[PDB]
């Protein structure tokens, strides 16, 4: 007939090939499609929505809703740290279980930036100021309010606006997002002084993910039956 | 680096989903597996990011054999042929190896002898609805939804064997094709406990540390 010649790699099953295949049930006439709201075309648009960060882990708040609340009280010291967390990826940091941090665990290398939105969930009569410093990789954690001022920082006046955004690169020292008391919390009478602060995270620009792998967060010994 | 995070680059991967053995002369050896993605934990977590999925299906079967110890006197056997019967949802189902439900004309089957390429076959989107629903808050028994039922697979030898028992093991590889996904959903945090339902035991939010500063 027609003369053909079989090359090596012929009767093999490479698990990642794209070949044709005969249909098991032809002449079935499957159900046509439908407009359903909320279609997804890419995984990065799941990453670009906000999610609350558990900044207050603290070994007994993880089984509670207190893991998300950053406590604020009107202290007596002149300058004091509120929180601070590094940006070292993987090594059990706080950005790991979030909505963005569990999509980046399906990929081996990634690079981009981070939107860090805070929200003062306190009384409407209270007034205060905060620092929001970002230490770049190479510079240490600032041990005082004064040398944290000389870096990149945003002075956050609570009584004017209730949300301050601090954009920050994140790539696979590596950084710190510390926050400092600038002034105290001034409050009227018959108003409580113990307030809270929440923190959301997102992806500002488009990321760049390569080399998909499997996540370490889910495992199995026996089949589910 | 822009297209690595698309849906087709995320879900169109092959994955072993079932593994069973069967002997020929035992009158108990023949395989059976209902097609669902809720057995293996690494495939289940990727499909449960979305509420409604719609994909074609594509299966490949790697069948080997073994020579179980016989009595004596010069075992020499010809090549073995296997049958892989697909039962569409709402069809007859065998109860023994020798049964009239194998020979029915509406259950498409493939035959394959040892020593060739493995027997691929492909199944389109078979459902009365418009999407497979990974999560169903309601009753049909709670949270079952028989509307996304993809069928059942049965396997057996067709060669009658006289001198030597032979057991054979089949591994099924599972690959979605032309995936559409709707209504994203947060990823699972607790461990999976059962197959049919979404039951769990409560777990912490994250790994803990010593101080907030």
């Amino acid at each position, epitope marked *: 007939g027609l003369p053909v010649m079989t090359t090596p790699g012929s009767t093999q099953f490479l698990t990642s090939d794209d070949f044709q295949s005969p249909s098991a049930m032809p002449q079935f006439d499957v159900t046509p499609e439908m407009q359903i709201p909320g279609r997804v075309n890419n995984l990065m648009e799941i990453a670009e929505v906000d999610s609350v960060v558990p900044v207050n882990n603290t070994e007994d708040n*993880v089984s509670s809703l207190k893991a998300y609340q950053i406590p604020v009280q009107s202290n007596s010291d002149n300058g004091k740290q509120v929180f601070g967390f590094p940006l070292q990826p993987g090594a059990n940091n706080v950005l790991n279980r979030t909505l963005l941090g569990e999509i980046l665990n399906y990929y081996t290398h990634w690079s981009g930036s981070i939107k860090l939105t805070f929200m003062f969930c306190g009384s409407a009569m209270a007034t205060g100021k905060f620092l929001l410093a970002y230490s770049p990789p190479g510079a240490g954690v600032p041990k005082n309010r004064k040398d944290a001022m000389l870096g990149t920082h945003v002075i956050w006046d609570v009584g004017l606006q209730s949300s301050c955004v601090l954009c920050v690169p994140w790539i696979s020292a590596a950084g710190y997002v510390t926050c400092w008391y600038q002034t105290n919390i001034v409050v009227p009478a018959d108003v409580q002084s113990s307030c809270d602060i929440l923190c959301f995270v997102s992806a500002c620009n488009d990321f760049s993910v390569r080399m998909l792998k499997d996540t370490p967060f889910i495992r199995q*010994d*026996t089949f589910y039956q | 680096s822009r297209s690595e995070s698309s849906i087709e680059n995320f879900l169109c991967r092959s994955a072993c989903v079932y593994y069973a053995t069967y002997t020929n002369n035992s009158k108990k050896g023949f395989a059976e597996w209902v097609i669902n993605t809720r057995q293996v934990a690494q495939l289940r977590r990727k499909l449960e990011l979305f509420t409604y999925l719609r994909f074609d299906l594509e299966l490949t079967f790697v069948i080997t054999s073994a020579q179980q110890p016989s009595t004596a006197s010069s075992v020499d056997a010809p090549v073995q042929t296997h049958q892989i019967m697909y039962v569409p949802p709402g069809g007859p189902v065998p109860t023994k190896v020798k049964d009239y439900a194998w020979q029915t004309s509406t259950n498409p089957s493939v035959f394959w002898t040892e020593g060739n390429a493995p027997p691929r076959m492909s199944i389109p989107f078979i459902s009365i609805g418009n999407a497979y629903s990974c999560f169903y808050d309601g009753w049909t028994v709670y949270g079952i939804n028989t509307l996304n039922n993809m069928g059942t697979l049965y396997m057996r030898h067709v060669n009658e064997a006289g001198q030597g028992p032979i057991k054979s093991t089949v591994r099924i590889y599972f690959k979605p094709k032309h995936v559409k996904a709707w209504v994203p959903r947060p990823p699972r945090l607790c461990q999976y406990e059962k197959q049919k339902n979404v039951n769990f035991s409560p777990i*912490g939010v994250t*790994t*803990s540390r010593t101080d907030i500063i």
Partner: nanobody
Amino acid sequence: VQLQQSAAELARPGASVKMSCKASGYTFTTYTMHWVKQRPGQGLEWIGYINPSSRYTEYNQKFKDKTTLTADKSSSTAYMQLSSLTFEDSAVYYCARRSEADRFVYWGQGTLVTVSA
């Protein structure tokens, strides 16, 4: 990938014994740790479990008033304290790790507790 228990002990009836079951090889605060009692005359008997991520324990009704299962995250161990020993409290105690909601995949080696004078 394995568990380790304490050694066998001895106590007077009326006193208290406290065992340990140190786990290693995995994230300790994911899976719940159980406790099974083997009297030498009969089969195994269930005692209870402790969810380590929340310190929530739930005991079988036959052993509710005595045992107290605690855990600590630092040394990744889990304990059980037996108060008010009697002559029926001489058995072998195991610790298991329940996974896939019914299957005890990994067990300990067991510690023998005896009551005498």
